[PDB]
Sequence to fold (493 residues):
Amino acid sequence: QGRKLATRDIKMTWDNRAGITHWKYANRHVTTGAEISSGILTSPEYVFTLNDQQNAYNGDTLNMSFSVSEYAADSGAVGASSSFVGVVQNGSYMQTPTQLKAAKQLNGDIIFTWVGRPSWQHFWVVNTSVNDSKTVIFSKEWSSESLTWTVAEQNEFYGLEEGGATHVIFMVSEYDPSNGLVSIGAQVTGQAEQPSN
Amino acid sequence: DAEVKAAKLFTDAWVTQKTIDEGLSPPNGFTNSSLDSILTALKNNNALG
Amino acid sequence: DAEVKAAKLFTDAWVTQKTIDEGLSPPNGFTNSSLDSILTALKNNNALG
Amino acid sequence: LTTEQINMTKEQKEAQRAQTSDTRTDGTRVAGSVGKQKELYDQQITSYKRDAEVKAAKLFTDAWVTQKTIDEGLSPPNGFTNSSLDSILTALKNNNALG
Amino acid sequence: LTTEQINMTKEQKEAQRAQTSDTRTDGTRVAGSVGKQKELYDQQITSYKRDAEVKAAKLFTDAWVTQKTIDEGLSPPNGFTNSSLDSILTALKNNNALG
Fold:
């Protein structure tokens, strides 16, 4: 099953028989049969980043042809392969938040505000650490357009006791409670906004 | 390249005109939409800059 | 290279417009997110600079 | 002399085999003179790509520098902080044998 | 004459052998003329990589210098302190035979 994430990447999920630990995969071009990449991966998921899409295609795509087979490490063995050639689960019918801002406050809290469609009040928010850019804390859904992130920065995440974190990486996107599909979304990155006076 | 030379020849004169007199209407080629398209094309072609 | 020349030709005129009259909204290609993505690409490709 | 020319013709044949296939008859990699040329060609391709990226990167960076000069208080893009710069100078120092 | 040409043909054989393979017949490495060319090719590859890195490093450092110029009091990234500069200068003096 193909899934186009909010960050415009594409990810797939495989059911695990629990009897095998390794798998083999093959990724191909769409118009031609040229093979973009191949190898062995030890996890049941593969993420095809937007940089690879831009390297292969001049633009990001909604199409893919993927073949995966389960592989044994002790003896080189390749079983039957499952092929998926259709479009990914997409999710483009929903729009995306237009403008996003992050502002520091004299209290020390950070206020994230975005403008969304009146009809769609379901949103998904993702936050990442500035040190590693992969910690992906604080991931949930919020119906409220404005978010107050309070003082979670000082506690249990950063060793700083009172300084907090000036830099933020935030990303919000429309969410569907039933299907789970997620729009492209918008991001903010930088020092945020220092408060007046 | 032959086209780009003359294009630059015109663009420099327009830039001087804008510098001397403010309030000149841009020719719609320097608005935000066309520039945004140009930048996204650059980002896409060169694998994210 | 053929693309980059014309792209620079446009960006210079936008910079002139910005420096003449402040408060212009950026074309969304000069925001912080796109610059951060470009810098990460440069750092990753060239083995951390 | 005929036996010696027998020995030389095989070397000529393999040296000209190297122009189509990577492996060399019995099954070893080509490793002399030609291998260095192929390595140079690969390095030239990568350098082409890197320069092509760097041009557009500079095109964006100059505009951000002008924006910062005009209006102070703009937030760095998170790539201009002290940590990323420190990593960059550490890499430059390490690769070039301490500058 | 035939005996001496027999002697010369072996050298032609090894000169042609030097292209595809590194080892020279009996099992000794190629060491003259060709070896220097291979060393030049390796050095050219490394220089390509170093220049490619240096360009992006300059791209970042210019932005940091602009940031420092606009707003004073910025803490240096620890790569511009006196110790690293002193090490770099000592390396320059030592490598180039005291400048």
About this structure: The beta strands of chain E are 23-24, 28-29. The first helix of chain E runs from residue 2 to 20. The radius of gyration of chain E is 26 Å. The CA atoms of residues 68 and 97 of chain E lie 35 Å apart.
